Design a protein around this ligand. Structure first.
Ligand SMILES: N#Cc1cccc2c1[C@]1(CC2)NC(=O)c2c3c(c(O)c(=O)n21)C(=O)N(Cc1ccc(F)c(Cl)c1)CC3
Ligand SMILES: N#Cc1cccc2c1[C@]1(CC2)NC(=O)c2c3c(c(O)c(=O)n21)C(=O)N(Cc1ccc(F)c(Cl)c1)CC3
Ligand SMILES: [Mg+2]
Ligand SMILES: [Mg+2]
Ligand SMILES: [Mg+2]
Ligand SMILES: [Mg+2]
Ligand SMILES: [Mg+2]
Ligand SMILES: [Mg+2]
Ligand SMILES: [Zn+2]
Ligand SMILES: [Zn+2]
Lengths: 184, 368, 368, 184
DNA sequence: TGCGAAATTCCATGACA
DNA sequence: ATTGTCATGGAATTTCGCA
DNA sequence: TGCGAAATTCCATGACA
DNA sequence: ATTGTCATGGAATTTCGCA
């Protein structure tokens, strides 16, 4: 069997609804399976149209051999199936109610959901402008298993933005009280 | 100098006047019978006015000015006097063209890594397409990998919006651009400082300096032209297609596509290269690090027969950027303060301003 | 061609397929282990679609198209097939640039006598001066003697008015001009026929053909520029001064002014030449007839390393005159009917129209 | 003494008032003394201003060393004297009531006055457009004394307009009656 | 150890307005 | 306070297939 | 029969938008 | 159914002045 490579598999999913930011409510999350590189796209809905518009931006940079997702409406539609067939992309689904990806990808999606929650608190309506910094943080985060960050694995070089300050990602008592105050 | 001409009529030798000729007085003026004919020798006190009168007829150069003078007069080293007037005529100095080519171009080293240097520039105005008129082109210097963004104007706001999307992937060390309003604004300088990005600017009115992105602008326009043959010029929807097409196009001299230089592996695009299938990603990245260092690099071409290279203290003239109708194409002489490299200089104009200019936009002031 | 590939799998030799290689079947397709790696051999019936698919990604040339194909496939003489597709792609043929320079310029013989040929052209629009915007420039081919007329438009009426004033002195055999509206009008053709003047036209969009007058336009503008330094651009009153100044200016290569070539004697202007004072007018005219025949004549320069010269039957493409944004710079192939000289040809486009064009506005269609 | 040359002397004079043609009433006649070459300029008056405007056109082609004329107001003015001094032109006048030029010039001015009279008859208001053809005729008219026409003597070549048809210049009985009918 | 042809490399030309 | 670039297709040169 | 310098000739460069 | 041109000022080369 051939070694794992970048672009072999892209794992996509939706995060949201989130508080509105510049008219956006969702985040389409794309994670390369091999490198763990993350691309984030703000959408106004978890629809096929929003997925196709966002993925057309990504697939102008790199096309995956396979796209992996859950059985979400946007991904199981015949329109999304036509879009993938047109690009030579094989669609792969997880069994309903059983989301399976990979250890690395599951861990990455945890970091994304937690990093977003940490930065939402205090400014839940300003996340659109934070998407570029959130991605750089994630892609410049060292992998204990692989020895390299997603950026190093994708480009084969060190980055000009090393994220040496390995932040808490966990919430403070102040942030916990502020988050529970927002849930009112 | 009627004293100098007095000793001449008497018959005693004066340095500059050949002794083998007959100097005489006629019609109240010193004359000489020379092979060409009898010429009037004016006193040195009259020569400056004569040279200036001949030159001013049509503001002629050395030979054309001399040929008029030689019709009536003769004196020692006439061209030395002609050249003194040519070098003092402000009208000729700022209006005449240069006849000395610039020295051979520099072939700057290819940036060592992707994201070391970006070359950014605008294409447009283009026929309107979905309300869009411009294209922001971002070329990575090492790889040649290009990102395309449609804009409604070549503005700071549109550049910033586009670059905030691009820099989600990686932040570059340097951003090289020309001196377009969008890139020289304090809002853009602030945007770069905020991110640790150094802004490098091309010398003014020298797009060759931004050669890396200019060259990609040609390929972008050529592909959009081809795709739009016998169809309306709806380019907006083609930018993603053109971006992907060019990033995956082989450079016959390198034998690599910009995508391969950036990632070291082809994605799921047609005719993807399969040569590293049995290699691990680490083995593949090791081969990519080797490929990136052994890329062909061109060397400066030979200098032309009559080129000029700048020297500190030299009087040079900057070219007028947008000369008005019937107005000089050159500025008044400037002095070369520093020679940054054989193709770039720091000059001090008559105002006292320091300007970093390309020698392509300079001529050395004639007649010293 | 699955029949051709069948005998190959069996093991018997087919012309074009090296016998030293192992041809096998895998995943329902004919493969070959080559030094570069294992490549798929498609049947001849599939190759045209493959070449076209690879080419169409970015409408690439020979090597860039081949490098994509070579990633997955191998077949005998691949580039022969690539070139067949390149030469049939209308989008590439009309959009790509030429990489063959025109042959060396012709240096047409100097007209033998003054008034044999006039070169006429317009300068403008210039900053308005007394309601005037243009200058009609008339250059005698032999002498270089120029006449200047201020006009409000580059029109037939203004040309006719000016030329009726000039032709009071002498009528020319030929009037050479470009294809500007003022000169190609039936009213101007009628004006010339009425006088026995033959109208000669430059090939379209080739001002080098009118080189004699274009070159004088530079001198006119250069002198007006100099005279107007630090003054408003009131050129109207300077046209008579500029005309007289240039007509009495030495050409350093000829060692004669246009006035001297026309009259054989200087008029009462500054620094008038006095060398023929003791000659009779007949002796003076005899010396002038001799001077006019011994003038320096330049010869065609060397051809560049990669120049092209037209051949009857050859497929060539005329350059689009004013190409719109994102539109081809070349017309569809044309055939060379007649080679008038190595720099001028008669072509037949796809419409069936006969056009006399300069090779500077042509490229030979690539890939035959 | 040095041989006679073109531009040594220009003999100028006014012809008119003539019937109005394109608003013009006079003709300033310039004849080169040596070659006998003629330049004609329509003026609206025999004034210094009209002379200077017309001669500025001619002196943009060739400057004479000397200008010869009668004691006409336009030529004796201090303005015309200033114009000549500015151009290095010496002004020369004939004694009042004694117009002296040269045999060749006197004969040329006769041909001009007669050629104009011949063409005026029938179309006395259309002479402005005929000035170019009148000049070509005169300058391509063979000189019995010199063997060459003014054009040959000025340019040292044959012309593209030889005036082989040596016309009458004298009036017909029809033209005489038509001219005497105009004088009514 | 060398031939004919195919493959590769060279590189002038031109355009980024 | 900076600096030309590189796709293109004939021609020149090298390599390949075979002996 | 030759030297140093002045004079002349050569000619690449660039602009006629 | 026509076609490049030539002013310009350093450099290269020739000629001049004298011996
Ligand atoms: N116009 C304009 C204009 C409008 C807005 C802002 C600015 C300009 C601006 C300077 C800043 N002004 C210019 O004149 C200009 C130009 C080019 C520019 O990218 C460019 O930004 N500018 C350019 O791309 N080109 C093409 C070219 C020509 C020759 C070459 F050798 C190369 Cl490499 C490229 C030249 C003109
Ligand atoms: N504009 C325009 C235009 C307006 C009205 C009528 C016409 C034009 C017209 C063709 C007819 N169209 C043109 O494009 C044009 C030009 C020039 C013209 O004299 C000229 O009449 N035309 C011209 O003089 N130039 C300069 C130039 C450039 C490169 C050179 F090698 C030489 Cl020798 C001269 C080029 C453009
Ligand atoms: Mg899920
Ligand atoms: Mg720009
Ligand atoms: Mg540009
Ligand atoms: Mg024209
Ligand atoms: Mg022109
Ligand atoms: Mg009189
Ligand atoms: Zn001057
Ligand atoms: Zn094509």
């Amino acid at each position: 069997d051939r070694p794992q490579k970048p672009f072999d598999k892209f794992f996509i999913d939706y995060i949201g609804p989130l508080p509105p930011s510049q008219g956006y409510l969702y985040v389409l999350v794309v994670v390369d399976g091999m490198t763990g590189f993350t691309w984030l796209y703000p959408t106004k809905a978890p629809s096929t149209s929003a997925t196709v518009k966002s993925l057309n931006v990504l697939t102008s940079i790199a096309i995956p051999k396979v796209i992996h997702s859950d059985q979400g409406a946007a991904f199981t539609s015949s329109t999304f199936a036509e879009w993938a067939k047109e690009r030579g992309i094989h669609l792969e689904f997880s069994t309903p109610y059983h989301p399976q990806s990979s250890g690395k990808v599951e861990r990455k999606n945890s970091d994304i959901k937690r990093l977003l929650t940490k930065l939402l608190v205090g400014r839940p309506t300003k996340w659109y402008d934070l998407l570029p910094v959130v991605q750089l943080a994630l892609n410049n985060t060292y992998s204990p298993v692989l020895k390299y960050t997603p950026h190093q694995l994708l480009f084969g070089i060190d980055s000009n933005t090393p994220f040496a300050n390995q932040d808490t990602l966990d919430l403070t008592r102040e942030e916990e009280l502020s988050l529970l105050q927002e849930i009112r | 100098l009627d004293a100098e001409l007095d000793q001449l009529l008497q018959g005693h030798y004066i340095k500059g006047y050949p002794k083998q000729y007959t100097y005489f007085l006629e019609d109240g003026k010193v004359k000489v019978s020379r092979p060409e004919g009898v010429k009037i020798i004016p006193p040195q006190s009259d020569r400056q006015k004569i040279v200036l009168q001949a030159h001013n007829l049509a503001h002629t150069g050395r030979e054309a000015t001399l040929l008029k003078i030689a019709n009536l007069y003769w004196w020692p080293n006439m061209r030395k006097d002609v050249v003194k007037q040519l070098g003092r005529c402000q009208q000729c100095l700022i209006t005449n063209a240069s006849n000395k080519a610039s020295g051979p171009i520099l072939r700057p080293d290819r940036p060592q890594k992707p994201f070391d240097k970006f070359f950014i520039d605008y294409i447009g105005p283009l026929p309107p397409s979905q309300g869009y008129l411009y294209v922001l082109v971002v070329v990575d210097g090492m790889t040649g990998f290009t990102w395309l963004y449609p804009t409604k104007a070549p503005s700071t706001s549109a550049t910033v919006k586009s670059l905030n999307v691009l820099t989600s992937i990686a932040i570059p060390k340097v951003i090289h651009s020309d001196q377009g309003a969008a890139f020289t604004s304090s809002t853009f300088a602030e945007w770069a400082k905020e991110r640790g990005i150094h802004l490098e600017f091309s010398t003014p009115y020298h797009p060759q300096s931004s050669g890396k992105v200019e060259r990609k602008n040609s390929d972008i326009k050529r592909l959009l032209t081809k795709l739009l043959v016998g169809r309306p010029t709806k380019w907006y929807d083609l930018l993603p297609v053109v971006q992907l097409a060019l990033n995956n196009t082989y450079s016959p001299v390198l034998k690599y596509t910009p995508h391969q230089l950036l990632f070291g592996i082809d994605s799921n695009t047609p005719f993807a290269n399969q040569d590293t299938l049995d290699l691990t990603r680490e083995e593949e990245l090791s081969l990519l690090q080797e490929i990136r260092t052994s890329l062909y690099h061109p060397s400066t071409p030979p200098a032309s027969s009559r080129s000029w290279s700048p020297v500190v203290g030299q009087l040079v003239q900057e070219r007028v950027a947008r000369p008005a109708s019937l107005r000089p194409r050159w500025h008044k002489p400037s002095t070369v303060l520093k020679v940054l490299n054989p193709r770039t200089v720091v000059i001090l104009d008559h105002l006292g301003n320091n300007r970093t200019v390309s020698i392509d936009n300079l001529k050395p002031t004639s007649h010293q």
